[PDB]
Amino acid sequence: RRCAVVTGGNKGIGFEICKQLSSNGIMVVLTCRDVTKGHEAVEKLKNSNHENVVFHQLDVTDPIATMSSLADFIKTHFGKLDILVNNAGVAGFSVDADRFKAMISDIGEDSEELVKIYEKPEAQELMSETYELAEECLKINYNGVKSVTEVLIPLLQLSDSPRIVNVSSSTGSLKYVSNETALEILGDGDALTEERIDMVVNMLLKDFKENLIETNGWPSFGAAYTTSKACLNAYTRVLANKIPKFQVNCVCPGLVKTEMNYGIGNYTAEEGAEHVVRIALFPDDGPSGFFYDC
Ligand SMILES: NC(=O)C1=CN([C@@H]2O[C@H](COP(=O)(O)OP(=O)(O)OC[C@H]3O[C@@H](n4cnc5c(N)ncnc54)[C@H](OP(=O)(O)O)[C@@H]3O)[C@@H](O)[C@H]2O)C=CC1
Numbered sequence: 619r620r621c622a623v624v625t626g627g628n629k630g631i632g633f634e635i636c637k638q639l640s641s642n643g644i645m646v647v648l649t650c651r652d653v654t655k656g657h658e659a660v661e662k663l664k665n666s667n668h669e670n671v672v673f674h675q676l677d678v679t680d681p682i683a684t685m686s687s688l689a690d691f692i693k694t695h696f697g698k699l700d701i702l703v704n705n706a707g708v709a710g711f712s713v714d715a716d717r718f719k720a721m722i723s724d725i726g727e728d729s730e731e732l733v734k735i736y737e738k739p740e741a742q743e744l745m746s747e748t749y750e751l752a753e754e755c756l757k758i759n760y761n762g763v764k765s766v767t768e769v770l771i772p773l774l775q776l777s778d779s780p781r782i783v784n785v786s787s788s789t790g791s792l793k794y795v796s797n798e799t800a801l802e803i804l805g806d807g808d809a810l811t812e813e814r815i816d817m818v819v820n821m822l823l824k825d826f827k828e829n830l831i832e833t834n835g836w837p838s839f840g841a842a843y844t845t846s847k848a849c850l851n852a853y854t855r856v857l858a859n860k861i862p863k864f865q866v867n868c869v870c871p872g873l874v875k876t877e878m879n880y881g882i883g884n885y886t887a888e889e890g891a892e893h894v895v896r897i898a899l900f901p902d903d904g905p906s907g908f909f910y911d912c
Pocket residue numbers: 625626627628629630631632650651652655676677678679704705706707708758785786787788870871872873874875876877878879883
């Protein structure tokens with residue numbers, strides 16, 4: 619049996635990825651940071667007749683040394699890893715829940731309008747981004763992906779067909795990278811390295827902390843998130859180059875109705891996960907280094 623690790627597996631797209639991989643005969647290690655939430659998710663899938671799922675704790679921001687226990691667990695019970703889905707991620711902003719629920723109620727969750735207004739200024743007024751949230755966003759969406767990937771690479775090396783799928787967003791496209799220095803680094807594909815991508819991340823965090831978002835031409839809203847995904851894409855390309863044995867790709871699942879969006883989206887969680895699972899289960903002869911649907 620092929621086996622998979624999915625990060626952020628307790629809810630949203632991640633939970634549905636675990637369910638669908640399991641449905642396709644994959645042995646799934648559902649990981650997430652909250653132990654109670656993890657056990658409840660696995661119990662829920664079992665009660666749905668998905669038996670090839672097991673829980674293991676994983677907060678992607680923890681030290682890489684702590685992750686050694688996941689690596690050992692997989693080696694001991696499975697002998698290899700075939701699939702890693704880097705799904706865990708956060709938006710980098712909070713919302714006024716009361717007013718957001720009022721806005722959703724008012725419009726009606728349907729009529730493309732709800733999705734339309736979610737992107738209007740009327741909506742941003744209900745959202746708050748802070749340096750604290752930015753720092754966490756980058757640690758989870760970018761650095762966390764690097765740590766989990768580094769720890770599990772030696773197990774993926776043992777697979778005859780290793781795959782890494784990183785869940786990205788189209789807002790991470792270079793078209794939205796406004797800062798000139800960042801655009802220059804991320805757009806110079808031939809010169810991409812992990813170190814240069816780290817520079818972009820550190821540049822953003824430094825400017826954010828020093829209140830230079832507007833001043834240095836960063837996006838006026840959602841700069842942490844969009845930067846984290848643009849850096850995730852670049853890192854995905856670098857990793858693809860470094861490890862030609864692997865399939866390493868990003869997938870942008872479209873706008874999905876999860877708690878990340880307070881239920882707003884074009885696709886259900888099931889549908890979003892389907893988009894990611896189609897790449898995770900590519901034939902053994904598959905491409906690497908690309909950004910699907912981004
Ligand atoms: N929903 C959308 O429209 C889109 C989502 N994406 C990407 O899809 C991925 C999943 O998003 P989605 O399902 O919508 O969001 P959800 O908020 O519903 O789920 C997020 C998952 O990530 C977990 N998570 C958050 N921080 C950490 C951490 N430090 N360590 C381990 N797990 C963590 C959450 O755990 P917990 O329950 O403990 O908080 C949860 O399991 C993300 O990378 C997101 O950026 C890309 C394009 C569109």
